[PDB]
């Protein structure tokens, strides 16, 4: 039902800029066990590689972290009180390293025990934007059953499900731009 491929989106230039940061993304991905291509994909989608991007919501920087939510979440994962400042989120290394942490948090928490890497990946990008909870809720009210129900799908049926079930239009959209972004990235030798 969500017309999620319209308009088309040219990954080239936003991935090009995102790729500026790939050395950090490589290090960040490595440290947190996150696919560096995913990190770069997210940077390209959320900020188009612009480290000073700032949303209506006051989400900040390359990976559009919000200090009160994902910021706070990552601070607690590291044993820290409080939230990162705006200033620290505009730092490209701290920002990316924090997005990586946050992706790791989603993978080892809300989304734990997804089998297929590719669905996992799609789940991450939709969770990252519009929240793991809202995603699971589209399957079932109980987490464990929603996850069993996700493992009964392959990536394309997952995308179909998000397209028809997720309230947020940007959820399936992100999966489309993920794939455009991964395509642009084959033109960059690791």
UniProtKB/Swiss-Prot annotation:
Murein-degrading enzyme. May play a role in recycling of muropeptides during cell elongation and/or cell division. Preferentially cleaves at a distance of more than two disaccharide units from the ends of the glycan chain. Prefers cross-linked murein in vivo. One of its GO terms (cellular component) is cell outer membrane. GO terms for biological process: cell division; cell wall macromolecule catabolic process; cell wall organization; peptidoglycan metabolic process. Its main location: membrane. The N-terminus is blocked. It comes from Escherichia coli (strain K12). It is an enzyme of class 4 (lyase). It catalyses: Endolytic cleavage of the (1->4)-beta-glycosidic linkage between N-acetylmuramic acid (MurNAc) and N-acetylglucosamine (GlcNAc) residues in peptidoglycan with concomitant formation of a 1,6-anhydrobond in the MurNAc residue. Belongs to the transglycosylase Slt family. It is a lipid-anchor. This is Endo-type membrane-bound lytic murein transglycosylase A. It comes from the Bacteria. Keywords: Cell outer membrane, Cell wall biogenesis/degradation, Lipoprotein, Lyase, Membrane, Palmitate, Signal. The gene is emtA. Pfam families: SLT. It is found in: Cell outer membrane. GO terms for molecular function: lytic endotransglycosylase activity; peptidoglycan lytic transglycosylase activity. CDD domains: LT_MltC_MltE. Its EC number is 4.2.2.n2. Coiled coil: none annotated.
């Amino acid at each position: 039902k969500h017309d999620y491929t319209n308009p088309p989106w040219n990954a080239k230039v936003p991935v090009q800029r995102a790729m500026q940061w790939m050395p950090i993304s490589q290090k960040a991905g490595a440290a947190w066990g996150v696919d560096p291509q995913l990190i770069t994909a997210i940077i390209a989608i959320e900020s188009g590689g612009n480290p000073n991007a700032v949303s209506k919501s006051n989400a900040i920087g390359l990976m559009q972290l919000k200090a009160s939510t994902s910021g706070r979440d990552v601070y607690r994962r590291m044993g820290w009180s409080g939230e990162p400042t705006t200033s620290e989120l505009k730092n490209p290394e701290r920002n990316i390293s924090m997005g990586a942490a946050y992706l790791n948090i989603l993978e080892t928490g809300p989304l734990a025990g997804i089998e297929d890497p590719k669905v996992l990946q799609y789940a991450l990008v939709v969770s990252y934007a519009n929240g793991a909870g809202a995603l699971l809720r589209t399957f079932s009210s109980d987490r464990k059953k929603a996850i069993s129900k996700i493992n009964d799908l392959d990536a394309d049926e997952f995308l179909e499900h998000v397209a028809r079930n997720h309230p947020a239009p940007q959820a399936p959209r992100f999966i489309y731009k993920l794939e455009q972004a991964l395509d642009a990235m084959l033109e960059h030798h690791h």
